[PDB]
Amino acid sequence: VPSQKTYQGSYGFRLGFLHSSVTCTYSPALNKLFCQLAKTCPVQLWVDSTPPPGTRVRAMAIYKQSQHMTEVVRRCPHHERDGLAPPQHLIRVEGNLRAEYLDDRNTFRHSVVVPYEPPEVGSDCTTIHYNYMCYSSCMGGMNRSPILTIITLEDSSGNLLGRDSFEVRVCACPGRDRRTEEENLR
Ligand SMILES: [Zn+2]
């Protein structure tokens, strides 16, 4: 099972989030992103030093709870029904002409990878636009089992260079749900 532990590594890799009728909102308190289905989720990649050419960025979802971490996160039957992302994949990347949709031969886990690109002129960070294609309610079962998105910075061979992660709740009312959860967190 993929590790969720933060690993800034040698390039000082870490994620940043943007608040984007709320379609996508991030709670620092809960280290949790709340977003609507199939809407743009801007995730920022920050590094202290530019990684080597050929560096890649992979996004993968896993269940948070240890008791279900061996289960593969995938879309529900209803939702697995752009000609690029396989219908079974929860996470899609929007606006990248080099996204690769992968299925691990041994674990059957899904992931989407794009080349790492240095911040463009006029920016201090690199931003990736993710879309979540199924609701937490579809994937969580009775006791709403939460999922985590794990983002890894990798070299051309797949070797780990850095990792960061966040809980994600894909839901109809991101704004309301965040308030409810932060409320309960108090
Ligand atoms: Zn679904």
Half-sphere exposure of 31 (CA within 13 A, CB side): 14
Does the annotation list 173 as a binding residue? no
May I ask the CATH architecture of the domain 1-186? Sandwich (2.60)
> By what method was this entry solved?
X-ray
Does the annotation list 134 as a binding residue? yes
Does the annotation list 79 as a binding residue? yes
Does the annotation list 125 as a binding residue? no
Q: Break the chain into its structural domains and give their ranges.
A: 1-186
Measured in angstroms, the resolution is 1.9
Centroid of ligand 1 to alpha carbon of 55 (angstroms)? 32
Q: How far is Cα 6 from Cα 86, in angstroms, rounded to an integer?
A: 28
What is the token pair recorded at 107? Answer: 């674990």
Half-sphere exposure of 10 (CA within 13 A, CB side): 8
Residues 6 or more apart from 36 whose CB is under 8 A from it?
A: 23, 24, 170, 171, 172, 174
